[PDB]
Design a protein around this ligand. Structure first.
Ligand SMILES: Nc1ncnc2c1ncn2[C@@H]1O[C@H](COP(=O)(O)OP(=O)(O)OC[C@H]2O[C@H](O)[C@H](O)[C@@H]2O)[C@@H](O)[C@H]1O
Ligand SMILES: [Zn+2]
Length: 249
């Protein structure tokens, strides 16, 4: 929280952000890895992959319906609010997230890229029909497509599956032009998302990591703030807004 950091942010020409599950932790949603991580209690090999879904679609759907209810009922936290405000102020140009929740949107964020899909989306496993839901379905019965009758599935990206080309390309273009990137709440291990901040640094930009833990990205982060995203981002944005308000214009 030194002048240099605030300066880097306030004077940035094209700041972007990459967020992970840690940014939703303060909304009561557990992260995937770490202490109470979901992947530590639930096996990603049975809940986060096409093979498992085909084997037992009822089990996978029951789990996602539960997660959907949790997210739809959760509220955006101070971190979500801070990112939306940083965008309102004209500083944050684009927010790229690995999160499948819609908390960034519900906080007011407008230019959001969902690298790994969204829990609000449900799509067919056979035809191209897809749509959004207001609340979680009850399982059983298995959600079936009203177009061809085939099994529907959560509109999220599972392990081994390819991120939508257009989505990753858009994110790539964003980081290729960013001079500063805030990387908050992500463990920096899952690819290709984890490689996006490297693009910014390789091109000459700065990395600002926000995470209570150190990660594989920490060694190259210009700034690495050990704290919760809610507290850190709220303070950072308030300081940035103040700095901007002081400019003689
Ligand atoms: N309050 C907090 N504020 C900021 N960061 C936090 C907070 N609480 C926890 N974290 C950090 O959030 C990070 C979350 O790491 P992950 O659980 O691996 O979440 P993520 O990086 O988004 O996962 C990537 C991807 O893998 C998953 O399978 C899934 O598809 C996901 O999108 C951790 O490094 C953790 O320390
Ligand atoms: Zn269909």
């Amino acid at each position: 929280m030194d002048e240099k950091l605030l300066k880097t942010i306030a004077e940035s020409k094209y700041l972007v952000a990459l967020t992970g599950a840690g940014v939703a932790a303060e909304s009561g949603i557990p992260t995937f890895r770490g202490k109470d991580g979901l992947w530590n209690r639930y096996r990603p090999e049975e809940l986060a992959n096409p093979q498992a879904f085909a084997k037992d679609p009822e089990k996978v759907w029951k789990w996602y319906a539960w997660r959907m209810e949790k997210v739809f009922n959760a509220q955006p936290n101070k971190a979500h609010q801070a990112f939306a405000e940083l965008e309102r102020l004209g500083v944050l140009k684009c927010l790229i997230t690995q999160n499948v929740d819609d908390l960034h949107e519900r906080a007011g964020s407008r230019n959001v890229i969902h690298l790994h899909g969204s829990l609000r989306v449900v799509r067919c496993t056979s035809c191209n029909n897809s749509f959004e839901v207001e609340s979680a379905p009850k399982i059983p019965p298995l959600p079936k497509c009203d177009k061809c009758g085939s099994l529907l599935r959560p509109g999220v990206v599972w392990f081994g599956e390819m991120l939508p080309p257009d989505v990753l390309d858009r994110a790539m273009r964003e980081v290729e032009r960013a001079d500063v990137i805030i990387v908050a709440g992500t463990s920096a291990v899952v690819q290709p998302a984890a490689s996006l901040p490297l693009i910014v640094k390789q091109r000459g930009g700065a990395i600002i990591e926000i995470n209570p833990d150190e990660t594989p990205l920490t060694p190259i982060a210009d700034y690495s703030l050990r704290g919760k995203a809610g507290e850190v981002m709220d303070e950072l944005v308030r300081h940035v807004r103040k700095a901007l308000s002081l400019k003689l214009n």
